[PDB]
Symmetry: C2
Subunit: 46 residues, 2 copies
């Protein structure tokens, strides 16, 4: 879980976002939303 722990420090991701375009940032937000929604389905099923 090295990529999940980095998401907790926004300042670190802030420096990484400065080297990427907005279109790549939109795709990254989609994947994180699906990952949280995937766990939401397991929480709603239990």
């Amino acid at each position: 879980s090295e990529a999940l722990k980095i998401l907790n420090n926004i300042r670190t991701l802030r420096a990484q976002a400065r080297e990427c375009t907005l279109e790549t940032l939109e795709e990254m937000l989609e994947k994180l939303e699906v990952v949280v929604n995937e766990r939401r389905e397991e929480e709603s099923a239990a």
Copy 2:
């Protein structure tokens, strides 16, 4: 940008999410939303 490129592969984040609780996943989604919104402000200003 090692944490930003990992977010593109949801299957990889999928295995990492299985080892964390939903509360930690909610905070991670907040940071990514703020990172994308921070770049949105720069795009709207330009």
